[PDB]
Amino acid sequence: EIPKPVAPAPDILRCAYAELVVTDLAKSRNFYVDVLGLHVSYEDENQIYLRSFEEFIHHNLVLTKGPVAALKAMAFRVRTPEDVDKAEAYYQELGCRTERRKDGFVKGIGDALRVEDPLGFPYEFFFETTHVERLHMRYDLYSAGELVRLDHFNQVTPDVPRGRKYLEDLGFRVTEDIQDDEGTTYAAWMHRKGTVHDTALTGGNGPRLHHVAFSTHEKHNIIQICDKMGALRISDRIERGPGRHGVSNAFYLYILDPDNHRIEIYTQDYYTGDPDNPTITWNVHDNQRRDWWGNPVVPSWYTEASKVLDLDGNVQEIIERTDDSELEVTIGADGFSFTRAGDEDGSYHGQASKGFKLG
Amino acid sequence: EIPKPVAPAPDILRCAYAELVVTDLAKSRNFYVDVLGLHVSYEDENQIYLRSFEEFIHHNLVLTKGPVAALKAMAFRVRTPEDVDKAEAYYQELGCRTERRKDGFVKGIGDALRVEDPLGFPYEFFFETTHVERLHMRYDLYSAGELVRLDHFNQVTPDVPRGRKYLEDLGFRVTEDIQDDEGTTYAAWMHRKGTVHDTALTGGNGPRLHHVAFSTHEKHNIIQICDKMGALRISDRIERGPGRHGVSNAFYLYILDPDNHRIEIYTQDYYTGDPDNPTITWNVHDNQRRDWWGNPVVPSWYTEASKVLDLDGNVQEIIERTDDSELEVTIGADGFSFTRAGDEDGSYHGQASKGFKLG
Amino acid sequence: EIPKPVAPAPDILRCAYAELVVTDLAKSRNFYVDVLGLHVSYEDENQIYLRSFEEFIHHNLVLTKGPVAALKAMAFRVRTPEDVDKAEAYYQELGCRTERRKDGFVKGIGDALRVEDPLGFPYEFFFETTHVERLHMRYDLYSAGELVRLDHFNQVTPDVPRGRKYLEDLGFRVTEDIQDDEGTTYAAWMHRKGTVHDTALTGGNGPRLHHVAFSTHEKHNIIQICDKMGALRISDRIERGPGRHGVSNAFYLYILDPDNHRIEIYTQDYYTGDPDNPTITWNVHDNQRRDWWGNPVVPSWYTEASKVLDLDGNVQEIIERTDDSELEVTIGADGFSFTRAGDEDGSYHGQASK
Amino acid sequence: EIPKPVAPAPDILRCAYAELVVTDLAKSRNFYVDVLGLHVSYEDENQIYLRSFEEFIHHNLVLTKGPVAALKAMAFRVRTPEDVDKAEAYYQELGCRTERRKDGFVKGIGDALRVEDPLGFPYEFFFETTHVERLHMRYDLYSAGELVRLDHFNQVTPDVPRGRKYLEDLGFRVTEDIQDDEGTTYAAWMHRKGTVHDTALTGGNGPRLHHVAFSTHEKHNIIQICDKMGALRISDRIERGPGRHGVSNAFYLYILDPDNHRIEIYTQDYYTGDPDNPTITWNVHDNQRRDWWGNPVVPSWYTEASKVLDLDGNVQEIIERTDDSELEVTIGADGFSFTRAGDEDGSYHGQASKG
């Protein structure tokens, strides 16, 4: 277990941006700008800085050209300048490598701390950022599929309870989780900003980045993204969805960028800001937990995720999960799922729902 | 091959209602009224008469208690009383069994002709019907999933060109179809009322009734039906969808009633009323033809459909399709489909899209 | 009264396009293409040809540069080539001025008849048209405010019953109307294509064109048009709405183009294709008849409308309505409306609602 | 000016519920339950306890039968039980009348502090509340007009800067306001929970309660409320909207309950939780500031608002605003508004927009 430091945790506001390394900057720009409609704050031959419709900080996504596609940083904004100092002390007490840059790692961010966290993930904490034009009423620019906010990250890690405890000490509150009756946690969701989550842990080999998620206003905006991908004849880049989540109650879609980085589009989860917010636990065999309508979860969703980098820019080595696999226990050969607890009718033995099996 | 009569075709307005035989009237009522929110025009211990939100004729659906669940009649309204006489002469010239009842077969319909048509289907033609309160502005009744119109039927028949020719002579115009490069037709859609279809032919063993379809106003209304079925813990009765169709461009969902009769919910197809309306032909291997987003078509959608009755109430014998099977050529072990014609990337061989094979 | 010809009526499919004369083509292009997102089928220095998202015929709207903004033609598509001959014989029997151009009046239309109709309106009938790419699945082009179909026209004319009977003889069926207990007709809606209308008559001084209407898929698409006009700081060109109509039950918005031509955006009316489709008559004093939510109808909506041209391109003289005025009897000094009939609570006297 | 206490402010989470006094409990039930679809947590012959679709605390609205329709309490939830102690100390230092009940004033709330605040409003602060079934996935119950959350209160007060300073000291952050070029403030919006607001101040004679606001998921849910009101032939209880707000950017509707308490339905404002969230100031003459589409604001929206009670349950006396009136300066006989700053075209003199 990861000890609770004596040093106070930084006051984290929210997820703020991700830096993704991409192999072909022009192909990635086509995806995030021409397909998805994100707004360009800055670009050059090496990077593209993108933001959502309602954002006022400099960016929500930095695309950085490099040799190996990977997550380079997942950044959280803290409440005050002094919280960056607290972050450095906190992670130092945890025994983690840290790097501090007074003028930032990326453009439009000031004083910033990056850390190799105890789960092997590159976290950034910052307060200072260049404000830009907030585009929230620029309906002259608004797309039929407009991405309005950055909502969350989702991380793949082999030991969910170990990670959960560490994030709770850092001040994240768990809103929902998936467990079974034999003591295994498969996934947990945790927040600072008062939505279902700012980050989440998914059980699996890791550290890897499962996805970054953006919000829309309405469900039809997500439908439009699907429709547009069909018109562009890139429906093969729709991985899973659209659907209604069980966990989070959000309407959702997962798509894959040119380096196979997974992006979720998400809308209409619920308020979690009260400190005694009720924590919802789903059983791993409940076939409504991930897709409320019971649609099967494609195997790539469980197996595939992005590499993450260390502070030197090298790929983090992957540690195998030894706990039970959500894929295996639900849709694998000895898997099981139910529609109604205790009812054989609507249950699935050794295959996925709706008439499918693993490819 | 079905000859064109010398007798003039009746002028058909639209699909108007279906009579479905159901085995447990109370369970069927729970589904169509309590789950789906259709409006009761009349009911007793033997039948329930149901209509959509915007309908003014007596009903769109009659549920008739009987021993064997089946389609008993699919009914089309004709333009004038005289058109019922025309239908009788037309089908008599075709050599079909007919039955005329001056006071109707079901309540709220007057002079009506039922026929066992050349494809083995029980068609009804009528003009006279009892008008009811049109509920189109009854927003005090309006459900979050409100079904607003009857849109179409879909019929399974072994020889699609044979049926298509016959329906063309009856005045239906083909709007879309699905073919391969070697001259096999897998499906066709055809209309009278100026939408994509009033009925459609799906290649397969038949006669069987594939589905009846109702419309909603908006896409979110279809989403709500899915959400409600999740809340009722009957997500196992969601068969396929929700999705965007390729053919028709409509947003859709398929669900299964207590006797496994398939119901489609459908919205936002396009106007076809001009006589030179451009026909659209899709290749059977195009993985965007049925679901525009590339989501896989569940095998049950290809294989399962309702029995139909003859005019005595006995089940019609099934005749096997000898032309190629859409299931087998697209998602079976020797099947294939593409995202982009000629492109290996985004193509699927011997399995369905998105990472599944047949269960 | 307009006699019924012995000559058979042309079989009219639907409203198909309008040709509007505009005074500044570039300003009009900015409104219809950059603001509203219509799709260009052809343009040059004199004209812009535009179509909606789901259209396959050449255009739904022709903008033609000219000295005086006006309606130049409201065009209906007919079922067959021979229906253009029928239209010519029909209007000739009516005594109307007609002009036939075997190669069309505008690009992308072939053999076409224009008439000065008995109500003074420039109608076109055509079958032949150049097919174009139907954009209905081009979601890469789809706007948050996308206009998907041309739905209808609305005509201002002084005597509604006279016009109604003429249109019924042409095969249009009345779906809804507004009347009072004294027997005055204020407005009527009538169709060929199986929606609430292809054209409509509004009682007033005419001939004038009240509006041209386009459809969207959903209500949020109409909202987005309003939001976009706010962002462009042209909210003064939102005239009325957004709202729910009583008549038609459609969700709606009215906006004004740079020459003050009124454009309605409209969605989700009901099917009318059965020949005994029930006709709905509203009372003129029912404050839910025009806006179901009881929002007031601004006077400009009743009084302002576009000039129309004759076949020479000159402005048609206007005839004053002598029947009672809907404006005067509902929101004028001696007017009134109710929310619930017979209830003084929620009634309005000598003023509009809200 | 209201002094800043030495005593630390309580940590306020969010607006949580309002207690409204109503005259005919059955008629109010029909409005809030049958028309609007709120969910009953508890009822008897004296009170109805209602909650929104996504709520887990006991209620968002309490309807209490009484002789005079009024706001009895606007309640904010605080972060810990100790924050109720902090609230008590804070308001006592301000010289405000307070009353603390360890077992609450209404059912489903535990230890609670009510105060007559420096602006004359009845505030409640509480932590302890009875959890109930969260209905957020009960799509078997979901209405086409479903109200999903409580969003905010709006208060009418004569001196907006005075109130703004007091609320800032209490930890609310101003997100948007309306001012003119002559030093007058007409309205301010301020938050704790990271939306545009938990409460707002509207300049006018006060203390009165302008409205209570509930959220929907989507814009069509608000349109449905309007459509249903038309079908019920009660469209005369739609006061203003539906519309898009300028301030807040939310889609909105205002309707009137049987005692004329004003309810707003609201959706799709933006995130404000960062502490340097950019403040937006509108000019009072900007005709897109309240309705972005330029639709006129009816005079009743400016003039009418609910009485509020003191801790003894008596109506607070109304103090007259002496600052300029937003009604008068925009839509009165000497009013002015503009569509485009500096453009005579689309401007309005001595009247409201749209004719």
Ligand SMILES: O=S(=O)(O)c1ccc(O)c(O)c1
């Ligand atoms: O699945 S398809 O796109 O082929 C299709 C299109 C329209 C329908 O009504 C249908 O049932 C099926």
Ligand SMILES: O=S(=O)(O)c1ccc(O)c(O)c1
């Ligand atoms: O305002 S009305 O409800 O009378 C009306 C209904 C349908 C229309 O298309 C229209 O322009 C006007």
Ligand SMILES: [Ca+2]
């Ligand atoms: Ca177990």
Ligand SMILES: [Cl-]
């Ligand atoms: Cl999931």
Ligand SMILES: [Cl-]
């Ligand atoms: Cl406002």
Ligand SMILES: [Fe+2]
């Ligand atoms: Fe996620």
Ligand SMILES: [Fe+2]
């Ligand atoms: Fe269908």
Ligand SMILES: [Fe+2]
């Ligand atoms: Fe209209």
Ligand SMILES: [Fe+2]
């Ligand atoms: Fe408000």
